[PDB]
Coordinates of C-alpha atoms (C1' of nucleotides) in Angstrom, one line a residue:
Chain A
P1409 CA 101.6 66.3 76.9
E1410 CA 103.1 63.0 75.7
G1411 CA 102.3 60.7 72.7
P1412 CA 98.7 59.9 73.9
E1413 CA 97.9 63.7 74.4
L1414 CA 99.2 64.6 70.9
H1415 CA 97.1 61.8 69.4
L1416 CA 93.9 62.8 71.4
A1417 CA 94.5 66.5 70.3
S1418 CA 94.5 65.1 66.6
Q1419 CA 91.3 63.2 67.2
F1420 CA 89.8 66.4 68.7
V1421 CA 90.7 68.6 65.7
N1422 CA 89.3 66.0 63.2
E1423 CA 86.1 65.5 65.2
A1424 CA 85.4 69.2 66.2
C1425 CA 86.3 70.5 62.7
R1426 CA 84.5 67.7 60.7
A1427 CA 81.6 70.0 59.8
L1428 CA 83.4 73.4 60.1
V1429 CA 84.5 75.7 57.3
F1430 CA 87.2 78.3 58.3
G1431 CA 87.9 81.6 56.5
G1432 CA 90.3 84.6 56.7
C1433 CA 93.8 84.6 58.1
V1434 CA 95.7 82.6 60.7
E1435 CA 96.2 84.9 63.7
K1436 CA 99.3 84.7 66.0
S1437 CA 99.3 86.4 69.5
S1438 CA 101.8 89.3 69.6
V1439 CA 103.9 87.7 72.4
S1440 CA 104.5 84.3 70.6
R1441 CA 108.1 84.1 69.2
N1442 CA 106.9 81.4 66.7
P1443 CA 106.5 82.3 63.0
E1444 CA 103.5 84.1 61.4
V1445 CA 101.4 81.7 59.2
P1446 CA 101.1 83.2 55.7
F1447 CA 97.7 81.7 54.8
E1448 CA 94.4 83.3 53.7
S1449 CA 91.4 81.5 52.2
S1450 CA 87.7 82.4 52.1
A1451 CA 86.8 78.8 52.8
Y1452 CA 89.2 76.0 54.1
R1453 CA 88.9 72.8 56.2
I1454 CA 91.4 71.8 59.0
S1455 CA 92.5 68.2 59.6
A1456 CA 95.3 66.7 61.8
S1457 CA 97.5 63.6 62.4
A1458 CA 99.9 62.9 65.3
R1459 CA 103.3 61.3 65.2
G1460 CA 104.9 60.7 68.6
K1461 CA 105.2 64.1 70.4
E1462 CA 104.3 66.2 67.2
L1463 CA 101.0 67.1 65.6
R1464 CA 100.5 68.1 61.9
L1465 CA 97.5 70.4 60.9
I1466 CA 96.5 70.5 57.2
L1467 CA 94.7 73.7 56.0
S1468 CA 92.8 72.7 52.9
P1469 CA 91.0 75.4 50.8
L1470 CA 87.6 74.3 49.2
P1471 CA 87.1 74.2 45.4
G1472 CA 86.9 77.9 44.3
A1473 CA 88.0 79.5 47.5
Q1474 CA 89.8 82.8 47.0
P1475 CA 92.7 83.7 47.2
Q1476 CA 94.0 80.8 45.2
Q1477 CA 96.0 78.6 47.5
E1478 CA 97.5 75.1 47.9
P1479 CA 97.0 73.2 51.1
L1480 CA 99.3 74.3 53.9
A1481 CA 100.8 71.9 56.6
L1482 CA 102.0 73.2 60.1
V1483 CA 103.7 70.9 62.6
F1484 CA 103.3 71.6 66.4
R1485 CA 105.3 70.5 69.4
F1486 CA 103.3 71.1 72.6
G1487 CA 106.1 71.6 75.2
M1488 CA 104.8 71.3 78.8
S1489 CA 101.3 73.0 78.4
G1490 CA 100.2 72.9 74.7
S1491 CA 96.7 72.0 73.7
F1492 CA 93.9 72.8 71.1
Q1493 CA 90.5 74.2 72.0
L1494 CA 87.4 75.2 70.0
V1495 CA 85.9 78.3 71.7
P1496 CA 83.5 81.1 70.9
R1497 CA 85.5 83.8 68.8
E1498 CA 85.0 86.5 71.6
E1499 CA 85.7 84.0 74.5
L1500 CA 89.4 83.3 73.6
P1501 CA 91.2 81.7 76.5
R1502 CA 94.4 83.4 77.9
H1503 CA 97.6 82.2 76.1
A1504 CA 95.7 81.4 72.8
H1505 CA 98.9 81.9 70.7
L1506 CA 97.5 80.8 67.2
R1507 CA 93.8 81.1 66.1
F1508 CA 91.8 79.7 63.1
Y1509 CA 88.4 81.5 62.6
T1510 CA 85.2 79.8 61.3
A1511 CA 83.5 81.4 58.3
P1512 CA 79.8 82.0 58.3
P1513 CA 77.0 80.7 58.4
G1514 CA 76.7 79.6 62.1
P1515 CA 78.3 80.4 65.5
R1516 CA 81.7 82.3 65.0
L1517 CA 84.2 79.9 66.7
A1518 CA 88.0 79.9 67.0
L1519 CA 90.3 76.8 66.9
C1520 CA 93.1 77.9 69.3
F1521 CA 96.6 76.5 70.0
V1522 CA 96.7 77.4 73.8
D1523 CA 100.1 77.2 75.5
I1524 CA 100.4 78.8 79.0
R1525 CA 104.3 78.4 79.4
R1526 CA 105.0 78.9 75.6
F1527 CA 107.6 76.0 75.4
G1528 CA 105.5 74.9 72.4
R1529 CA 106.8 75.5 68.8
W1530 CA 105.4 75.3 65.2
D1531 CA 107.2 75.2 61.8
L1532 CA 105.9 76.3 58.4
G1533 CA 107.0 73.1 56.6
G1534 CA 104.6 70.1 56.9
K1535 CA 107.8 68.0 57.9
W1536 CA 108.3 65.9 61.0
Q1537 CA 111.4 66.9 63.0
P1538 CA 114.4 65.3 61.3
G1539 CA 116.0 62.9 63.8
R1540 CA 112.8 62.0 65.7
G1541 CA 112.2 58.2 65.5
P1542 CA 108.9 56.5 64.5
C1543 CA 105.7 56.9 66.5
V1544 CA 105.4 54.3 69.3
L1545 CA 101.6 54.5 68.8
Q1546 CA 101.1 54.4 65.0
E1547 CA 104.5 53.0 63.7
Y1548 CA 105.2 50.2 66.3
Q1549 CA 107.2 47.8 64.1
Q1550 CA 109.3 50.6 62.6
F1551 CA 109.8 52.0 66.2
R1552 CA 110.8 48.5 67.4
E1553 CA 113.3 47.9 64.4
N1554 CA 114.8 51.4 64.8
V1555 CA 115.7 50.7 68.5
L1556 CA 117.1 47.1 68.0
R1557 CA 119.3 48.0 64.9
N1558 CA 120.9 50.9 66.8
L1559 CA 121.8 49.4 70.3
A1560 CA 125.5 50.4 69.6
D1561 CA 124.4 54.1 69.8
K1562 CA 125.9 55.9 72.9
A1563 CA 122.2 56.8 73.9
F1564 CA 122.0 53.1 75.1
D1565 CA 125.0 53.5 77.4
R1566 CA 122.6 55.6 79.6
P1567 CA 120.1 54.4 82.3
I1568 CA 117.0 52.9 80.7
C1569 CA 114.9 55.7 82.4
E1570 CA 117.0 58.4 80.5
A1571 CA 117.1 56.5 77.2
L1572 CA 113.2 56.3 77.2
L1573 CA 113.0 60.2 76.9
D1574 CA 115.4 60.3 73.9
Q1575 CA 112.9 61.2 71.1
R1576 CA 115.3 59.8 68.4
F1577 CA 114.3 56.2 69.6
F1578 CA 111.1 56.7 71.8
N1579 CA 109.2 59.4 69.9
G1580 CA 106.1 60.0 72.1
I1581 CA 107.4 58.7 75.5
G1582 CA 107.6 61.3 78.3
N1583 CA 108.1 61.5 82.1
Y1584 CA 104.8 59.8 83.1
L1585 CA 105.0 57.0 80.4
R1586 CA 108.6 56.1 81.4
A1587 CA 107.5 55.6 85.0
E1588 CA 104.3 53.6 84.0
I1589 CA 106.2 51.4 81.4
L1590 CA 109.1 50.5 83.8
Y1591 CA 106.7 49.8 86.8
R1592 CA 104.8 47.1 84.8
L1593 CA 108.0 45.1 84.1
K1594 CA 109.6 46.1 87.5
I1595 CA 112.8 47.1 85.6
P1596 CA 115.0 49.2 87.8
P1597 CA 115.0 52.7 86.2
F1598 CA 118.9 53.0 86.5
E1599 CA 119.5 49.6 84.9
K1600 CA 121.7 50.2 81.7
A1601 CA 119.4 50.6 78.6
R1602 CA 121.6 48.3 76.4
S1603 CA 121.4 45.5 79.0
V1604 CA 117.6 45.6 79.1
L1605 CA 117.3 45.8 75.2
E1606 CA 119.9 43.3 74.1
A1607 CA 118.0 41.0 76.6
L1608 CA 114.8 41.2 74.3
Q1609 CA 116.7 41.4 71.0
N1610 CA 104.7 38.4 78.9
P1611 CA 105.0 41.7 76.8
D1612 CA 108.6 43.0 76.6
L1613 CA 109.7 46.6 77.2
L1614 CA 109.3 47.7 73.5
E1615 CA 105.8 46.2 73.3
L1616 CA 104.8 48.2 76.5
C1617 CA 106.2 51.4 74.8
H1618 CA 103.3 50.9 72.4
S1619 CA 100.5 49.2 74.5
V1620 CA 100.9 51.4 77.7
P1621 CA 100.4 54.7 75.7
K1622 CA 97.5 53.0 73.7
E1623 CA 95.7 52.4 77.1
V1624 CA 95.8 56.2 77.7
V1625 CA 94.3 56.9 74.2
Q1626 CA 91.6 54.3 75.0
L1627 CA 90.5 56.3 78.2
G1628 CA 89.7 59.2 75.8
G1629 CA 89.3 62.8 76.8
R1630 CA 92.2 65.0 78.4
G1631 CA 90.3 68.3 78.9
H1632 CA 89.3 69.5 75.4
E1633 CA 87.9 67.0 85.4
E1634 CA 85.8 63.8 85.1
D1635 CA 88.3 62.2 82.5
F1636 CA 91.2 63.9 84.6
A1637 CA 89.8 61.5 87.4
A1638 CA 89.9 58.6 84.9
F1639 CA 93.7 59.4 84.1
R1640 CA 94.7 59.7 87.8
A1641 CA 93.0 56.3 88.5
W1642 CA 94.8 54.6 85.5
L1643 CA 98.3 55.7 86.8
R1644 CA 99.9 53.0 88.9
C1645 CA 103.4 54.6 89.6
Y1646 CA 103.9 58.3 88.4
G1647 CA 103.5 60.5 91.6
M1648 CA 101.7 57.8 93.6
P1649 CA 101.9 57.2 97.4
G1650 CA 104.4 54.5 98.5
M1651 CA 106.5 55.1 95.3
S1652 CA 110.2 56.2 95.3
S1653 CA 111.5 59.0 93.1
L1654 CA 115.0 60.2 92.1
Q1655 CA 116.4 62.9 89.8
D1656 CA 118.0 61.6 86.5
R1657 CA 121.2 63.3 85.1
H1658 CA 119.0 66.1 83.5
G1659 CA 117.0 66.9 86.7
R1660 CA 113.8 65.1 85.6
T1661 CA 112.0 63.0 88.3
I1662 CA 111.7 59.2 87.7
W1663 CA 109.0 57.4 89.8
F1664 CA 109.5 53.7 90.6
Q1665 CA 108.9 50.9 93.1
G1666 CA 111.8 49.1 94.8
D1667 CA 115.4 48.8 93.5
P1668 CA 116.7 52.1 92.0
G1669 CA 119.2 50.0 89.9
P1670 CA 123.0 49.9 89.4
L1671 CA 123.7 53.4 87.7
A1672 CA 121.6 55.3 90.3
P1673 CA 122.7 58.8 91.4
Chain B
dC1230 C1' 104.5 87.3 100.7
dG1231 C1' 108.1 83.5 99.2
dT1232 C1' 109.6 78.8 97.4
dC1233 C1' 108.9 74.8 94.8
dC1234 C1' 107.2 72.1 91.2
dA1235 C1' 105.2 70.7 86.7
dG1236 C1' 109.9 69.2 77.1
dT1237 C1' 112.9 70.6 74.5
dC1238 C1' 116.8 73.9 73.0
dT1239 C1' 121.3 75.7 72.9
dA1240 C1' 125.4 78.3 74.9
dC1241 C1' 129.3 76.3 77.3
Chain C
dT674 C1' 126.3 69.3 80.6
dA675 C1' 123.8 73.7 83.1
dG676 C1' 120.8 77.2 82.5
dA677 C1' 117.3 79.0 79.6
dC678 C1' 112.8 79.4 78.1
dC679 C1' 107.6 80.5 80.8
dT680 C1' 103.2 80.7 83.8
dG681 C1' 100.5 79.2 87.6
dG682 C1' 99.0 76.3 91.4
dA683 C1' 100.1 74.2 96.0
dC684 C1' 101.8 75.2 100.0
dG685 C1' 104.7 77.5 103.8
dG686 C1' 105.4 81.7 107.0

DNA sequence: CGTCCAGTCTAC
DNA sequence: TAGACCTGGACGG
């Protein structure tokens, strides 16, 4: 999951939970090393927002709910396999690590944070990760300014393909988006980042960091096989036949067409 | 059967 | 940095 998946997971939670009232506790699986959520309320609503590669749930007790409680915020990072599902309460998928249970009246559902590989994390504060830069989807101008004012940072000494994964400057960009973004401008992935960015100090690389991920959000879906076909068809570069690939300095595969670029392994 | 492949996080 | 953290599907023998 990259920026577009975190955003669509947000839209899912807001849409699927619009007319739902939750009750009881927040249940963690016994194998999750993430923290217990100390929250009980007889009647609460769940809402969400995304920022880059993080998602924030707000748990909002209704007027008079008991025990007395203030709203609680949780922030999620999805790692390699995180997702939200709404399922029947007795049809929990495998690897449902955190569960929110609908109160009656109506079909007993669970909203589940599902994470096969368990690289996903949640924190009890409502706070975004300190050090992550602005959202490329929802805070474009702040994102763009934060890169252009910090080109002296040693992060920009690196290949552009490596710099695009650094969540201090490109919060929301992951391995498929870096390939798609670089393929549209035919920028060699191992061109130095500072060269490509001082050059833009006909959409430029920073506009595409916003508009390419926006295109994925516009497809819709992502699971929550027919929209998996839509995604595969949208991809022009990542994993595609006739495309080159190399390992970057952290062993992550960059897909590209043509010239690997000057700092290539 | 086995190998290989798919975002942080933190000891060195 | 390198290895760690994890499960499962595709594919080879």
